[model samples]
Target: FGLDLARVETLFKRELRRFDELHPRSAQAYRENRRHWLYGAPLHWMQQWPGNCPLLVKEAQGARVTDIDGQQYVDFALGDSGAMFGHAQPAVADAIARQARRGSTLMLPTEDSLWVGAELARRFGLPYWQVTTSATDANRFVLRLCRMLSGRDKVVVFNCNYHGSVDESQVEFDAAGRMVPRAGVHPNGVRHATTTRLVEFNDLDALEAALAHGDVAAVLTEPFMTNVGMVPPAEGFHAGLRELTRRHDVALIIDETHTISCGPAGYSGAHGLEPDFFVLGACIAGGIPSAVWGCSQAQAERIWAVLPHFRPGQAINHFGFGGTLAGNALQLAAMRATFAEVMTEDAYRHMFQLAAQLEAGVRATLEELRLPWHVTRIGARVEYLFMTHAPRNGGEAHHARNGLIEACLHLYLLNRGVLLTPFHNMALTCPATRAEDVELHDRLLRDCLGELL
Candidate 1:
């Protein structure tokens, strides 16, 4: 660790004072809203931001957010990937407006869905697609389908893998190597061990040992770990995964919710991955709260054959994948527009260019400071960890997560006009994110590190 601990403590105290002095409006608003909202914020998680109070947004546009006090910041969080393409994109906004007039949610298909379904296949290289209201829904449905198709009860998830509120994905490894529900996970559900298998990411030997038992129907994971820290898959991990899963008759589910930043077609399509089930969500409809899951031709056929059929009636109510608003006309229209305009190769090129600049600049600052910290970039997404090197597994990354330092850095940047993603030292670039924004972050971070040293 290159930090002077005493200096870090003093700097954090100064940053806290600066935050309280500058954001008087935000502080007052938080105090007023506490009576209305459960945790004084709409999202309880907002409390985690190291601030006297969260910045109450007045408006948001491409790559920037204006607070109630009229201060604007370069937004590198990008709504944590929900607004990854940029906020309220013109094409998607127009689509939403037009669809709103016609009707929002009709229990029927719109012509736009035909285009979106076809585009999904063309863009992601998948055969069949189905929509869900959120990535959480998509992940849950996929787990059920995998269990049904393979006739197995258990699914395998990497340690610290996040698939959005899915029950089995809620467990983690404890000190004694026990698979226990994560600290804040609800304990009222069915026991976790009955439904999930835990393995360290990038540990192919442990993965094979789990799958060899023939009790696991699926192995769900990100192409590269993003939730705990950016723990990329080890070389040959994906190749071995595919081969092992095939041999073991286990379906491989790739969740590209965050990794879609890798390119227009996402990491799987960009890097030639072959997964049985693929999930892309959050920003797919340009931040209109829609997600999609797709399957290979063979897997689609397999699902259809085993799926229980019911006549067109309410006789078999309340059973599988029954979200009415999931593939609505409005969502389809927005998705079609997002694909045609926002998530284009050109947009990706712009994002990647800015992201690379941000990544290199952060690394350069660390080198200049003679810090042992390392930074990583996956396409448009970049993260700097308080570690000497990038972690190959989730445990390594999780252990290295220094919350106090991360909070101090984030708050220091926020006091200026730069915003990074919360809970980690991550920054994302959008089509609208400018080189000047990257430069600003670089310059300020250099200054911040100097203060810490």
Candidate 2:
């Protein structure tokens, strides 16, 4: 009935040992690379999971991955949606292999690009499409265009929303709900202008207030509150947003990078939500480094009108936007196959079925344990938070967690053939996920709850 620090500590120590032995290659790699590599890993968040042990992944399939030591895991992480269709989908892989045999990365669009472009138009309902190496670049380029088209410098974004590392999208809210730069960041080497405004997810009042400012040229949102904890927009919230953006004559840009986990059409299409522009990435070209920023015909015309063209011998072309590897033929080949085969509605149905199973399993386990926690699911993507009630905003969801408990549970699962996304408690169901894998996570989660309780 009392506190159990001793028991928790003992469990932590045991899990740490189990993980270290299970992932020896990863452990040794970290130890050996620690001296030469900053943070002993390429990305900072990769080190968040316990054991100070980075499990070295050797291979991944639909819903599972094997560590270098041959330890297997139900990989609900799925490279945070980069492998949303499942790892190494044969159709996409075959297509890329075929294309790679010809050429790659010559900064030229492939013949297949027209098909990819047309598909984007059909799926997302945006008339114009542009390519980028990533969703970050897509968001940045479009935000610049929003400013250029509307002649308004400011943009409105949701608090705790992640549109990728576009520095302008990095603004957060202070205690006064005032716009402030995320710490340790100086966006565009420019002063903290209201060029970007931050608002709370589901906060209609704050969103309306931000829109009232004539200087705001666009509104960029993730459709769902993803990075801050998975909160879906409240009933009619998105409709209200659409009306407000229109009333203010501001462009609406929906960043569908993560929401692609929902469906092949992404959130915009699945939800019937329209945006002046839409940004997509991660598996869009089937794990190739490519992204699409889509726009309406008129908006596209405005964007294109500003472009300055030049001959082959010319030194410079205006509009000044291009990623070195944007729209490579190999990537287009991959995209063509992926869009046609991998991201089909049937594939999404398979993924959503698995995700539903996962959500049900987690809920049933919690219900059986009488644990005071809640879960939320979007298409094939699911997350469980510490709060008993569904969250209303990013801030509430962000705060609702037992950090130590979460780390312990994550480590326990990791030790037993389950891998979760680091930092966020996200479980992505790629097209390759199996029903059994969902059940496995359910078992692990239930086991973890028993240990903690």
Candidate 3:
């Protein structure tokens, strides 16, 4: 930050005092929750939100949240993009309610599932589709298919990439460049060395070298990395990736779980990315908890020829690909409703404009304060990094992070009725997000930065 350390500390202290005074109810509730829950929250990540404790939500709608203490906020975190389309969407709620009345899960496909599959094919440009309960499952299933088809042992992931809970995607490079499980990630019995390969994003030469090893099954990547503060692809990175994978006969997997922020078809759809397998989740069913994967027509043929079909006798118990609740009636209904209504081109147009507006505001503030920071955007998602230059790879982005500065920014904006994504200085614009919301964030952020200086 090149900031006054004492001033940063002082501002943080002031913000904490302000938060403690305003959120006594949230603080108390978290303490009570600690008695029963392991981390005082259902998801341990929930505890990571910067405050005396996480905000206890009473209601969230559109782009706004009202806490249990009766304070209202413009919610840019958007449930960590789980509620990216907006929380408690009316159409999605109606679909879930309507489907629950009929039945939530049955091992059979409904007419709605057919509609969703066809719709996905149309939107994503993939001929075949599969639905799973989550993006993690979708990634897992895709990798398994790749391994099965290629007869290979390892899958490649970029450094600091996150693909939900996929085990192979959990490893990062240590200071010594050794493959290791991410800092807090527990090592599995299936070692990362034998099952996974790590590389840096935008390093086409390194990627080619990694793929040169014929034992690798696939290259799983985002069109551009997101979790480590949005490392955009270098020029020709995708083109080289595609060319190299084709040369080596390795499969390509694009996990667009978060980059759906790019457009209705996600980054792949908007940018003409060609992947053998595609995974989408987080907001696909408007927070109903579902994910989807798809394959190209040629890839579908490979699957049909090589994969074993489930037989009625002994094979039934050992059948694979998905679980019992993989493609449930309720999920199909919610996806249909969300696709048909919530995530539309008009909605996306609104989302992008608001995000760009916020990005511009933040950039202006950084410039005015003479701070060595930069704001970058991909459609509706905007993030500010405490670096003078935008990072081209995860390693650069990883080293530039300042958790204290990040927490101060997050906590400061949060105290003033605006929220940033907890993990980074990221902001998202859903269809329901408004100009006033962006304005409030800009004002508060500028004030916070000015106070620090």
Candidate 4:
């Protein structure tokens, strides 16, 4: 580290003391209401950072969020890609305002849907598209379609992977290949073996063996696993997956929901990976509620055939596929504007630049400290892992967990006007992110390492 750890720790303590005193009202409010929230917050995950007091976001603008006590923070969370276009982007805001004047959800398709479908097709090479409330819903519906079309009973997913809130995704297999429910609720309920077949990513043999089950409908994947700490694909990994899935007659689906941070068209498009289905989620509507599931022309035919059995009339029905606000005009218009303006090539370039800045700063600082830890980056996204060496598999990544250090670092950053995503050391850049903005985080990271080491 550039500075002495002890000295920095002293400084950190001083700043924290000052922060508490400076924001007494907010601090007191948080304390008073702590009991009201389950685990002190509405969302269980919100309680992960070191300090028990959760910072209240009073307002947000381009690349930054302000706390209720008038403290300013450089926001690298970007709502974990929900604000990929940056907060309150002018184009998206204007579109939403206009859309609100016209209408919301009419259950009737709007021209925005037409534009989004065409754009998604061009970007992801998928000829057909559908909208849903979340990427979870999109992935779930796609899984259903895969089962319906392939007559398969099982779905294959990578180890240590996350594909949104789908129940089938939370399963894991034990040594005997029997499924174990991921650690939440289970004496004997929803075993992983029953719902999903898991294989270690980047292991060709394991993937083939799992697919040999023949009952596998689709291999749902993240081009590079981000939720498991930004694990990039090995050189021949994706190509081998394509061949293996083809040979096994299993469909390949790429969840670009998080990996869209890779580029404008996302990892699949940028890398020329051909998947039967491509899912775009989270930031699809530029911080609004929307998701997109897209597939080829052949897949569209299958979907159309099923539509009649559900819709069956002039009335635009849910068909178990549509959310009440899935295609709301406001969200569509926001998505349209985001596609047209906010998610431009320039925006991606800007975000990648910030990623580079974050990587350089953190990597150099950690190296100087001689700590057994390292940080990794993927375009606009970055994560600080506790291990010095990068993990080759999801299992290794899982073993690298260090909750104490993660919490301390997150709190340290928060107290210093930097807000990263909770729990995970992940940060993302937006169109509004600037080099100077990233530099602030880099400096703070160096300060934190200096303090803690």
Q: Give TM-scores for every candidate, taking all chains together and pairing residue i with residue i.
A: 0.97, 0.94, 0.97, 0.91
- lDDT string for model 1 (1-453, tens) is 678777778898999999988888999999999989999999888887787888899999899899988889999988878888888788998999999999989989999988988999999998899899999999999989888888999999999888997888888899998999987888566698799889999888999999988899999999999998799988999999999999999999999999998988889987799999999886978667889999999898888788755568646564577597889888899998898988887898899999999999999999988898899999999998888999988878888787778888999999998878786789999989999999999999999998888
Error of 3 at 158 (Å): 0.5
lDDT of 3 by residue, 204-241 (tens): 88888888888999999989888988899988989899
Model 1 C-alpha lDDT versus the unseen true structure:
0.89
- Superior candidate under lDDT, 2 versus 3: 3
Residue lDDT tens for model 4, 215-330: 89999999898887767788899999999999998989999988888888889878999889999885867667788888877767776676545434577555555667776777
Residue pairs in candidate 3 whose N, alpha carbon or C atoms collide under 3 angstroms: none
Which residues of candidate 3, in runs, are more than 4 Å off? 311-314, 318-320
Cα distance off (Å), candidate 3, residue 250: 0.5
Ten-residue region with minimum lDDT total, candidate 2 = 1-10
Better of 1 and 2 by TM-score: 1
lDDT of 2: 0.81
Report the C-alpha displacement of residue 197, candidate 1, in angstroms.
0.7
Candidate 2: regions farther than 4 A off: 1-10, 183-190, 308-315
Clashing pairs in 1: none
Question: What's the number of clashes in each of the models?
Answer: 0, 0, 0, 2
Root-mean-square deviation per candidate: 1.4, 2.4, 1.3, 3.2
